[PDB]
Design a protein around this ligand. Structure first.
Ligand code: D4U
Ligand code: D4U
Ligand code: LYS
Ligand code: LYS
Lengths: 506, 503
């Protein structure tokens, strides 16, 4: 009933041990077997069968406490996601080491224990460790929460260690997460790609449309920005001759937090010399179809799109995926023509009016790209939940770094894969002409002058590298935390990050 | 003069745009790479042409030469390998353009798309014989030669130029990536689990270092970049992930030199039920197996005093020497450092030792004092082999478990190559009551003006109360390890883009 008193009592227990000799936090307990190795080694065992001649050293944490009297104690020992029962029988206690009840009366739920004992099955067939001696390695001073206590509470986030022990689903989630990354690292390695590291602190934060973080180095007396993307120095490396290059790492964007946006998230971006939009389309279908089959043995997975209570939709990752041109589909759904230039007063007022007619949010500032972006967000982004699908060939006012379309004026060779209306992949044929790049950086600075503080600044060091000749390349970005959300059936980005960014408890 | 060169090539590109031809074509389908090309056709004798194999080649032209008007030669470099291109007036497809006009425009550094056949020259240099050559992306500047990158900062700002000219820089970052590749699989074979902890936190803990500050606007919240991955990894051990690690960047806001870049790559792992001794063997196993994986031997050549002096042989054969820090300082300085080490007297004693040896007084707490004594009297004891500094005082190690038999010390180890700290490990402190004792001690030395004194994480202290099992944790400095395995005397030579001033 009273956790504050429970913790105050256990604190006295630890100090009462030190006064009366014992050390409650010993340095080393040489373990002999792990609990998973234990279950494998002795699961194929008969009912009631003991092997009291094989003595083993095993560790773990107590998570269930019960007793069938003063002479038989029952526990649940967990370790590495698995579990065995501890069957402490008074007959098998090494009495030279201490009194049976005095030893086990101290055990509480959460205690980390070292056990010397032998393996066997119970009468009912429960595979158990049968201790000869049990020594406390690291006591748990607090009361562990119940599964109910964490269900719709933020303790999973602020106290992830509780979530990792109590909920089996949590360990499963993050084991899947690093399997997603393990797949992608080798998927690129087996294809001749070269993993690198580009700085996260920069004089200018380019590569995306987002407000950055700013820090300060004292000894240099220099203001550095946290990277919002890895796009530019990776393209500088293609110039350097590394024709197959990529990076898996954290990027930082100082903007709103919600179920799809954590301030720091993991991205992967690879750059592929002598590849284009089509290769990036085929790559995205190849990788996602194989990523999903690698984890599930199927191409169709089910996802609770509307939360856990409501029924799930089924997502079919089987290639090929639908391709939807952003301008012409917005055209069709709205029955209008977006005349070019898309950034003209006529086309901007037009889009303002169709945003106003449908009572959709007006973006501030009403830049032409944000109008198009909200139009695409409100009209084409949730077109398919049955499968992933590509929104392609964005106008050049939206894609300052994408190469212009080879047969469609004003558009780019850009693609974007969505799952359940959530952007998960960004790719395009790279804009490799320094003459046309400055015009998209100087037009972005004027967009910056209108209050669009996401409008990309002028990186000069990157512009100079374009002047030594960037070969025709194709680059693609992956939002890893979002891929993990869908592939682990979680509705929040806080559920696929170990320690998400939270409002402080003060 | 370069300025005129860039402007001619700049005007040259605009001429092509007005003249009709696209100077930056969208797509050239390559059939074969330059590495595959050498592998596929290395064995051809001097003079043979397979005129039937019409191939599509890519690369960067890095040499221009001619023999009259009908013969043109270039060096096509790609993926670190180089082949010849022999353009001859007979094989040229005259339907696509004039021979001389097509090839007079190609200059050193240009990205081209060649369609031709494989063959070896009369002198026997493996060549590609184009029927048609297309400029895919032009080099507008003048690329320097190898000497243009010697006495300059250019390698660090324009790493792409260094990678394109100095063939050794490409070897170093391949080695850097192979180092990390080996370490990840070394841990993964032993059941370790890779995670990613926050880089922005309410508190910067896990090391004795001053952090960077930043601000998240929507939350109106100041956040510190992580100086270590230590504390959030240990709370994951509490969560039941007994073999956890993270290979990533950490940020420390201090001075820059040849072994300090404000952001650097570390690897920390945490191994429950292991100890000071298990980590000692892990370090010896890993560094011996890593060296052998790279070099086929346990002995390395490293120019400790630069390429202008004779190098030394680093023998990574295990085991490595272990040296106690307080014991050795006391022997080498012929003094007695008494406990408490942060007592006024032995603080005054260490200060006087530094004074009569004429060493610089650290901005003078006992832990900073001890660190200075170790740096000048211990840390260069062994250069021919890596060695461990062990059993540090707890005054220095607030997160390390106290030594089980040596009072005042901890079960800590630091490994050094050529006097550079490259590894840090100890038996983790898991008694939460001793932890807050050590964190409150850091605040007293923080009150004396220590920017690098650890502030207490209340989240982390609460974590140990739920029970942190006996654990041994270790930390690697990836960049510094990369330096010694690539024979580099600066950390900037192993970081693709080191932190530097604006141009
Ligand atoms: O995860 C995210 O996805 C990216 C979008 C992602 C699409 C694929 C290419 C890389 C970028 C956008 C974003 C913003 C933010 O402030 C926080 C976040 O977690 C994310
Ligand atoms: O390279 C470095 O190594 C680490 C020391 C290294 C020892 C082994 C464990 C990981 C940390 C110290 C350091 C500080 C700094 O501000 C910039 C830097 O580049 C380095
Ligand atoms: N850096 C991009 C991803 C790669 C786009 C294609 N080069 C982004 O932030 O979305
Ligand atoms: N975080 C430590 C490395 C790990 C030490 C053992 N937990 C450091 O910065 O040196």
């Amino acid at each position: 009933v009273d956790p504050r008193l429970y913790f105050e009592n256990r604190s006295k227990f630890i100090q009462d041990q030190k006064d009366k000799g014992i050390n409650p936090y010993p340095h080393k307990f040489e373990r002999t077997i792990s609990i998973p190795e234990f279950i494998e080694k002795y699961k194929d065992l008969g009912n009631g069968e003991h092997l009291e001649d094989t003595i083993l050293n095993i560790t773990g944490r107590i998570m269930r406490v019960s007793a069938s009297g003063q002479k038989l104690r029952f526990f649940d020992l967990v370790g590495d996601g698995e579990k065995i029962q501890v069957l402490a029988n008074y007959s098998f206690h090494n009495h030279e080491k201490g009194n049976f009840a005095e030893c086990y009366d101290k055990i509480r739920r959460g205690d980390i224990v070292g056990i010397v004992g032998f393996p066997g099955k119970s009468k009912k067939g429960e595979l158990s460790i049968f201790p000869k001696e049990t020594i406390l390695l690291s006591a748990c001073l607090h009361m562990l929460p119940m599964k109910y206590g964490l269900k719709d509470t933020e303790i999973r986030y602020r106290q992830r260690y509780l979530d990792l022990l109590i909920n089996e689903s949590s360990r499963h989630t993050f084991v899947t997460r690093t399997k997603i990354i393990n797949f992608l690292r080798n998927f690129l390695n087996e294809r001749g790609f070269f993993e690198v590291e580009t700085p996260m602190m920069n004089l200018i934060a380019g590569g995306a449309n987002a407000r950055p973080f700013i820090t300060h180095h004292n000894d240099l007396d220099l203001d550095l920005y946290l990277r919002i993307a890895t796009e530019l120095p990776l393209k500088m490396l293609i110039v350097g001759g590394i024709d197959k290059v990529y990076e898996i790492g954290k990027v930082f964007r100082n903007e709103g937090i919600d179920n799809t946006h954590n301030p720091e998230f993991t991205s992967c971006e690879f750059y592929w010399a002598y590849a284009d939009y089509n290769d990036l389309i085929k790559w995205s279908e190849d990788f996602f179809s194989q990523l999903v089959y690698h984890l599930f043995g199927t191409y169709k997975i089910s996802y609770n799109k509307d939360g856990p209570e409501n029924q799930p939709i089924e997502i079919d990752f089987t290639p090929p995926y639908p391709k939807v041109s952003i301008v012409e589909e917005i055209e069709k759904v709205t029955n209008t023509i977006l005349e070019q230039p898309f950034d003209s007063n006529e086309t901007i007022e037009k889009m303002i009016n169709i945003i106003k007619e449908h009572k959709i949010e007006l973006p501030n500032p009403p830049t032409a790209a944000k109008l198009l972006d909200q139009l695409a967000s409100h009209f084409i982004e949730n077109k398919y939940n049955d499968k992933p699908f590509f929104i392609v060939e964005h106008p050049q006012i939206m894609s300052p770094l994408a190469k212009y379309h080879r047969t469609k004026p004003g558009l780019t060779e850009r693609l974007e894969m969505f799952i359940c209306g959530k952007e998960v992949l960004n790719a395009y044929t790279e804009l490799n002409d320094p003459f046309k790049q400055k015009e998209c950086f100087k037009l972005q600075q004027k967009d910056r002058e209108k209050g669009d503080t996401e409008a990309a600044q002028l990186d000069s060091a990157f512009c100079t590298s374009l002047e030594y000749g960037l070969p025709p390349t194709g680059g693609l970005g992956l939002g890893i935390d979002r891929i993990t959300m869908f592939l682990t059936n979680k509705n929040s980005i806080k559920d696929v990050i170990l320690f998400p960014t939270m409002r402080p408890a003060n």
